[PDB]
Amino acid sequence: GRLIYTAGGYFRQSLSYLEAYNPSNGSWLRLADLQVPRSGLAGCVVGGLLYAVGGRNNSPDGNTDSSALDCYNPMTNQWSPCASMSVPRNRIGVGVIDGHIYAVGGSHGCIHHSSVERYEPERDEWHLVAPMLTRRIGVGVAVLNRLLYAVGGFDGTNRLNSAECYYPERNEWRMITPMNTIRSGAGVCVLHNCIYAAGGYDGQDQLNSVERYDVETETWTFVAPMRHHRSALGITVHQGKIYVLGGYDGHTFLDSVECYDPDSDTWSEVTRMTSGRSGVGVAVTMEPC
């Protein structure tokens, strides 16, 4: 039995909460807080360990974009610092391939990244790889068939609907079919043969629409929309289902957690986080202790 981990986030100020949800009994667990508060970060799992990457600490004492990478061990319930990225990345995108972590775009100060970095766990090192064709922050990133996808985001001027794909063996980026909707800060994940883009901000209102890209047919298609509209949401897949946690709808920071079942193409409210928030890194791994 695995769990859904939610790290950091934002509600009134960046939070350092590490909470976990168990789909089996619907309960939550609070774990060791993050050493430093952060939101706009990305989470991911490698070799059973949880990684909190980038983000920003939006506090009263001031904003501080982070280039930190920290590891959380369910076995000990403790956070250990790792090699830091060559640059701070707020509202970062993250994906994993062959046990390697890819940090995509994000922002630093008023600058929007197009750069990308790859982290080697065993050697504990980061190295820059080919930069995206576009500068993107608030970008959603997912990995399918060992290929990395960068969807939507913001290049400083316009919210994007475009997306591209990175092919490791060639260290090159290639644009792909753009989405039907301009999406910034959407939850992007992979389920079966599709890359999902849920919610986000199109420059006018937080979205509740969800579209998926078929790598084969190379086209996007709208599926059942989520109950709530939500941007800067946490997302992840668990036992053939999409889970979207929190986010901002333009009025309040949501605490609702919706679940998507492809079979019946329907969403359901499955639980609520201990409290509403946005920009939280999400990932799945073994339960603690």
């Binding site: 934002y10 901000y201 800067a232 901002y248 920071f253």
Partner: peptide, 8 residues
């Protein structure tokens, strides 16, 4: 307020 995230 940031429309996309709701952050101040």
């Amino acid at each position: 307020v940031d429309p996309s995230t709701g952050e101040l």
